[PDB]
């Protein structure tokens, strides 16, 4: 059995070696052409570097405003991470929180916040007890809370967290937000994701179903610092996008057998859409309420 520390650096080593393998697979510089087709600054051509350049690099070419407000990128109509390297000469379009249809940006935000809460739980529970992460359900924005399913210890099968425990979870999430880590992205082979997450049967099942749904068995891994997780899609650039964060509630799922799956629910709001104290309290109460998928 591996200690939590050593499983952490081995996962980090595997992630770094795969990233170095992709960068070595693209050893020579190569110029691609990116056609900014946005409504603002129309028809703008960038000559980016292949598999090195980012939509953040395109935004940094344009202006600082595009860096600070652009949360996602449409590359040929598909949602693209801001720090994900570009592969092919395409058309780009930056998406912010305050667009006419911010739905993809919302999905990326809620997925990012769920993965941050999962990291908080995993590094919050004690060494003598056991933590495993099942998945983050793709729950709609309209529900009011992000959910992470965690299998906890049989010693804590009866245990219920208290208000100070939930506030400690919130303080750890705010510590991550203050640390301001970038959301590193890796498109990886299903085999490679399997030896990365080989010591988690639920992660193996999730990786297998993602490899089943796509033809080439390429899944998406994301990293904030040392925590690595499998994602359903693209994410926000930095944890500092989150401004108001709270781990509201913890619940048990209905089937206690064979194992107790606990759904952690939280609610968050970015800097660009920060709410007032009272409105935030009402959102807190709705997030404390049950969310079913």
């Amino acid at each position: 059995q591996l200690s939590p520390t050593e499983l952490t650096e081995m996962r980090n080593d595997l992630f770094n070696k795969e990233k170095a393998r992709q960068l070595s697979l693209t050893p020579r510089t190569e110029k691609i052409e990116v056609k900014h087709v946005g409504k603002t600054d129309p028809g703008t051509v960038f000559v980016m570097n292949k598999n090195i350049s980012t939509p953040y690099s395109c935004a940094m070419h344009l202006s600082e405003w595009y860096c600070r407000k652009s949360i996602l990128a449409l590359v040929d109509g598909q949602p693209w991470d801001m720090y994900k390297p570009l592969t092919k000469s395409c058309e780009i379009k930056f998406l912010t929180f305050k667009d006419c249809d911010p739905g993809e940006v919302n999905k990326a935000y809620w997925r990012s916040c769920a993965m941050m809460m999962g990291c908080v739980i995993e590094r919050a529970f004690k060494d003598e007890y056991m933590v495993n992460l099942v998945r983050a359900p793709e729950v709609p924005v309209i529900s009011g809370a992000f959910c992470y399913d965690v299998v906890l210890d049989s010693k804590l099968d009866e245990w219920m967290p208290t208000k100070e425990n939930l506030r400690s979870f919130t303080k750890d999430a705010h510590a991550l937000i203050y640390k301001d880590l970038p959301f590193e992205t890796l498109e990886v082979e299903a085999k490679v994701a399997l030896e990365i997450f080989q010591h988690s049967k639920y992660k193996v099942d999730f990786i297998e179903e993602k490899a089943s749904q796509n033809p080439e068995r390429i899944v998406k891994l994301h990293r904030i610092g040392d925590f690595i997780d499998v994602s359903e899609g693209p994410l926000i650039p930095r944890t500092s996008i989150c401004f108001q964060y709270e781990v509201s509630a913890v619940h048990n799922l209905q089937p206690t057998q064979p194992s107790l799956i606990r759904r952690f629910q939280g609610v968050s709001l970015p800097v660009h859409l920060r709410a007032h104290f009272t409105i935030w309290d009402k959102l807190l109460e709705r997030s404390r309420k049950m969310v079913t998928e």
Binding site: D99, P102, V105, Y109, I142, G144, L273, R286
Partner: protein, 152 residues
């Protein structure tokens, strides 16, 4: 001490104040959208609302005739008022004018304003619009509204 003083001290006196506001009101009725300093636009906005009320009182009213004769200095805008603007606002009750702030005059850096009568034929102003309902915060508040609806 200017407690409870609702009127601005403009021009060379009350003469010049009413004459300046009358000229601005005339330009507004003729062109349906003018730009002017912000204080003058505010005062003339109040007068424009009351003038449309008199136009809705109507041309057969001799009092409305005398008021329009005073406050319109070209005498062709009186048919325009009484047969164009009042029928345009026969359904509305008091929301006839729109004031927006335009940044600064390029010469003396005066706070500028554009005032228009609603409706119009001119190209529309770039009005400030609220955030879309598909925004994240609006979706959470809409879900809260639904939850309160099924709760009660």
């Amino acid at each position: 001490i200017s407690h409870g003083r609702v009127f601005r001290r403009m021009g060379l006196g009350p003469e010049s104040r009413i004459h300046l506001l009358r000229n601005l009101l005339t330009g507004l009725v003729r062109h349906e959208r003018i730009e002017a300093p912000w204080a003058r636009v505010d005062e003339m906005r109040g007068y424009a609302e009351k003038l449309i009320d008199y136009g809705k009182l109507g041309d057969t009213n001799e009092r409305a005739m005398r008021m329009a004769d005073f406050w319109l200095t070209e005498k062709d805008l009186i048919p325009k008022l009484f047969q164009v603007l009042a029928p345009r606002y026969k359904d509305q009750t008091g929301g006839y004018t729109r004031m927006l702030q335009i940044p600064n005059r390029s010469l003396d850096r005066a706070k500028m304003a554009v005032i228009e009568y609603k409706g119009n034929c001119l190209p529309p102003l770039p009005l400030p619009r609220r955030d879309s309902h598909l925004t994240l915060l609006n979706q959470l508040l809409q879900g809260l509204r639904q939850d309160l609806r099924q709760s009660q």
